[PDB]
């Protein structure tokens, strides 16, 4: 019986209020800035490179993906901003590689395609990291991997950051071998030249497809030599369109059917518009908002069962459903306290026991600072949550909707704690500590330095100390700085939060949920 009427979250914001008007205007500008930058990245190398690419009879990398996935199906692209201003004088749109999750023959797959128009498809250090991140996502969720191979090899000027280390180019083949041993299909489509390590990708794949003349692993390589004499090729394709058609057939023969471990209920849209998040949140991290408002606009029917509502109120935990999937939501609503950490630790155990996916909404401002709090083991309480979150085996997704500073990042399932996905809003900031705190802390150390030493240190000497620090933390905490390197899986428009979460959780459910084993809880 599911006919019980229940309460719903959310309230109607005051659209006429000046705060709402200002917050909407600021957030809208950030979203528009995000959109137009992606449009530029969409063009890859440029008109001359794109014209040359088409002149050889090859499809553009993004057109290949469009033809590969099922007609009209959504495509979840990851790390669109990798390599954004990462290198001083070189522009590398998207890192030279396009990765994402789409549906092929009704099966969710990870698609990894080299962008030959960007530096001829050479592998920059960020390119390796982006690919390795994609492989990690595919393995953790048991998603078949499809490699649209068109590459020019490693970028020699930066070889030391590509070849040698464990997380360098060599790890790519290691991941392929491991996934194959686990029956996670590895499919390679040679749609261009692949040299040196590149030739290993088709060789290490379970099934392999090569284009008639474009692909090379012509006399030295070529489809004919490998297809008919070397035997490296499993399928022979006339052109790019033919190869993509063959790939769809290969996936259809995987003999795989998705099975769900969780209970399912009919989907319902939230009771409030998503674009209202612009006014509610804004771009000023100093102002505070009720995280429940964000929740009310992404969960099915804006229905939410809060757990321990009046205890540790700076943290919000409860049960909801997104697109029918059950989810346990943990979101910051203020400074973390001992009660908040205990409340979170209790909640995480509940979700792990029932095998319920966890969603984290990071908007942190730090931990409570005080002599009494330390005497009561706030560190001991904060550690309880870091330790429960780490050991949890349910799928975990993290969304940074605000600041992410210090140990608060770890407790809320930061990148170091292997969340299945990590996304950030365009207004987010991340660093070891807030820019102001680092400035103020230094303003104590050197005020002390010269007060204790005895040479006076004046107020103008203070901003010759504080202004460079604040600039550095603002620049390095910017979402684009974080996303240019692969620290998150993408910057997403707040209006798209519900859709992105729905796609992400759906992909994460391809793998069975394991039992959680915890360490010692330091009581």
């Amino acid at each position: 019986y599911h006919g019980d009427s229940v309460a719903s979250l959310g309230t109607q914001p005051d659209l006429g209020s000046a705060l709402y008007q200002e917050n909407y205007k600021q957030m809208k500008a950030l979203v528009n800035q995000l959109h137009e930058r992606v449009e530029h990245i969409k063009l890859g190398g440029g008109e001359k490179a794109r014209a040359l690419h088409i002149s050889r009879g090859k499809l553009l990398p993004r057109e290949r993906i469009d033809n590969l996935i099922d007609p009209g199906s959504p495509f979840l692209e990851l790390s669109q901003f990798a390599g954004y201003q990462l290198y001083d004088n070189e522009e590398v749109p998207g890192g030279g590689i396009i990765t994402g999750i789409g549906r092929v023959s009704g099966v969710e797959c990870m698609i990894i395609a080299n962008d030959a128009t960007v530096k001829g498809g050479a592998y920059y250090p960020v390119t390796v990291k982006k690919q390795l991140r994609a492989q990690e996502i595919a393995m953790q969720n048991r998603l078949p991997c499809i490699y649209l191979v068109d590459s020019g090899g490693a970028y020699l000027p930066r070889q030391a950051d590509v070849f040698p280390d464990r997380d360098h180019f060599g790890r790519t083949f290691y991941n392929q071998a491991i996934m194959s041993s686990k029956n996670i299909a590895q499919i390679a489509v040679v749609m261009g030249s692949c040299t040196a390590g590149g030739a290993y990708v088709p060789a290490m794949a379970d099934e392999n497809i090569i284009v008639r003349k474009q692909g090379t692993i012509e006399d030295l390589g070529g489809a004919d030599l490998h297809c008919r004499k070397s035997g490296v090729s499993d399928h022979w394709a006339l052109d790019d369109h033919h190869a993509l058609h063959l790939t769809r057939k290969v996936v259809r023969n995987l003999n795989y059917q998705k099975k769900l471990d969780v209970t399912i209920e009919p989907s319902e849209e939230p009771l409030f518009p998503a674009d209202e998040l612009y006014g509610i949140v804004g771009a000023n991290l100093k102002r505070s908002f009720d995280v429940r408002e964000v929740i009310a606009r992404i969960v099915d029917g804006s229905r939410f069962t809060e757990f321990k509502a009046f205890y540790g109120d700076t943290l919000v935990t409860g049960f909801a459903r997104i697109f029918g999937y059950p989810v346990g939501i943990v979101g910051n609503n203020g400074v973390l306290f001992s009660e908040s950490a205990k409340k979170g630790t209790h909640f995480v155990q509940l979700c792990c026991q029932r095998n319920i996916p966890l969603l984290f909404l990071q908007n942190i401002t730090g931990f409570m600072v005080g002599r009494e709090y330390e005497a009561e083991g706030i560190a001991k309480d904060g550690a309880k949550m870091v330790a429960a979150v780490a050991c949890a085996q349910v799928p975990k997704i993290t969304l940074i909707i605000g600041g992410s500073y210090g140990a608060g990042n770890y407790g809320m399932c930061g990148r170091a704690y292997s969340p299945r996905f990590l996304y950030i809003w365009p207004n987010a900031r991340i660093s070891v500590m807030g820019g102001e705190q680092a400035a103020n802390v230094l303003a104590t150390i050197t005020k002390d330095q010269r007060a204790r030493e005895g040479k006076q240190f004046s107020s103008a000497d203070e901003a010759a100390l504080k202004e460079p620090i604040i600039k550095k933390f603002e620049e390095e905490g910017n979402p684009y700085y974080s996303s240019a390197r692969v620290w998150d899986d993408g910057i997403i428009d707040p209006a798209d939060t519900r859709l992105v979460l729905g796609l992400s959780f759906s992909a994460a459910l391809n793998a069975p949920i394991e039992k959680t084993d915890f360490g010692i809880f330091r009581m």
Binding site: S5, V6, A7, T11, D14, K286, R287, S288, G334, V335, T365, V369, E436
Partner: protein, 82 residues
């Protein structure tokens, strides 16, 4: 409980979110307020919080004035019994 009259019953009066200076007071000793009417603004550790009216009841009294430091969880406004 579904009627939301309960939401008024859950807490008798607004409390201070944290120990912080009162920066603004928007309510006189006797003022009619509706739920969501900002009553006070408080800065704690350089973080601005705006207190909002829990109920549509008229304000019986105010326990703090501007510039006062209010301790965490201390009553800020008294509302007339209805």
């Amino acid at each position: 409980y579904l009627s939301s009259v309960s939401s008024q019953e859950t807490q008798g009066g607004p409390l201070a979110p944290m120990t912080g200076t009162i920066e603004k007071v928007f309510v006189k000793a006797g003022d009619k307020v509706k739920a969501g009417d900002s009553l006070m603004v408080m800065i704690a550790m350089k973080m601005e919080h705006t207190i909002k009216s829990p109920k549509d009841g008229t304000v019986k009294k105010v326990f703090y004035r501007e510039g006062a430091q209010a301790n965490r969880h201390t009553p800020l406004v008294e509302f007339e019994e209805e």
